[PDB]
Amino acid sequence: DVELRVALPDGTTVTVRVKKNSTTDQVYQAIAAKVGMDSTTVNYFALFEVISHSFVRKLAPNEFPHKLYIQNYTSAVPGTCLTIRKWLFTTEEEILLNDNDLAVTYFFHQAVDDVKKGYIKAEEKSYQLQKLYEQRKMVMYLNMLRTCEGYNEIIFPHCACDSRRKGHVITAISITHFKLHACTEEGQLENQVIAFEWDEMQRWDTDEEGMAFCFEYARGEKKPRWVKIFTPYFNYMHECFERVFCELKWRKEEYQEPQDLFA
Questions:
Q1: In contact, 177 and 89? CB cutoff 8 Å
Q2: What does UniProt note about where in the body, tissue by tissue, this protein is expressed?
Q3: 2-86 has which fold?
């Protein structure tokens, strides 16, 4: 048995004892039980690894959280490199949890932090959000922030792309689109953005050897094209695609027979 520490959205840390070779899902479930999640909330959060002050990476199911915890332990210092964050692209489903105290509290504290890191641009509504924040009117704060650009959008660090000769791309993933932002090889934005609709996606895959996430898209009646994004986080990006399409299909599900044409 070994100790593991994991940061929570409210800034507190939880300690759990796990088997050394526990996988992501086993560790996540142990944390969820300890913090009091139930069947109504456990599926909206996940384990992430803090990569930088501006990026966290979702652990894939075959990873071992203790291996990562101890690898970064000295670098992590007082804090840990493991953290629980929301895993949800469909903001509409988030609103339906506004009567769930644990969900609201976690969503709230993460949102406050995501505004401070510039992920969510709240400048237009800053005055009312500050008033709601100071009154700890969490639901009202979240309902307003949910209208702001960047809410529930995952931004990846800049990286090379086989479909741009010179320069990098910054990948931005939300339930509404998959976006690529042009930037320089040193991360400097170049004021150009391409948006892909999710229903334009045909196939996607990883290339472990080539360190790439790959997707095939087709706009209108044109032939499909593959794009390679040379991100170190290709497994995470792949899991974002899987999650988005999972959430889109769940939404559809929530809202002579066709199964035999012949009588």
A1: no
A2: Widely expressed. Expressed in cells of hematopoietic origin (at protein level).
A3: Ubiquitin-like (UB roll) (3.10.20)
Phi, psi for residue 51 in degrees, rounded to 5: -90, -45
CB 138 within 8 A of CB 104: yes
Residues pairing with 226 in the sheet: 216
Q: Tell me what percent of the chain is helix, strand and coil, each rounded to the nearest 5.
A: 35, 30, 40
Distance CA 29, CA 42 (A): 8
- Give CA–CA dist 89/59, Å, rounded: 17
Round to whole Å and give the CA distance between 42 and 255.
Answer: 23
Residues 111, 57: Cα–Cα separation, whole Å: 17
Q: Give all strands (DSSP E) within the chain, no chain letters.
A: 2-7, 13-18, 45-52, 55-58, 82-86, 154-155, 160-161, 168-173, 178-183, 189-196, 201-207, 212-217, 225-230
| C-alpha–C-alpha distance, residues 32 and 230, integer Å | 33
The residue assigned the tokens 């320069």 is 167
- Radius of gyration, CA atoms only, the chain: 20
Vertex 55, ends 48 and 101: CA angle to 5°? Answer: 55
Resolution in A: 1.9
Asked if 40 and 31 touch (Cβ cutoff 8 Å), the reply is no
The DSSP code for 102 is H
Q: For residue 202, what are its two tokens?
A: 């045909």
- Are 107 and 31 within 8 A, CB to CB? no
How far apart CA 176 and CA 17 sit, in angstroms, is 39
Give one DSSP letter per residue of 110-174, joined into a string: HHHHHHHTTSSB-STTHHHHHHHHHTT-HHHHHHHHTTSBTTT-EEPPPBEETT-SSSEEEEEE-
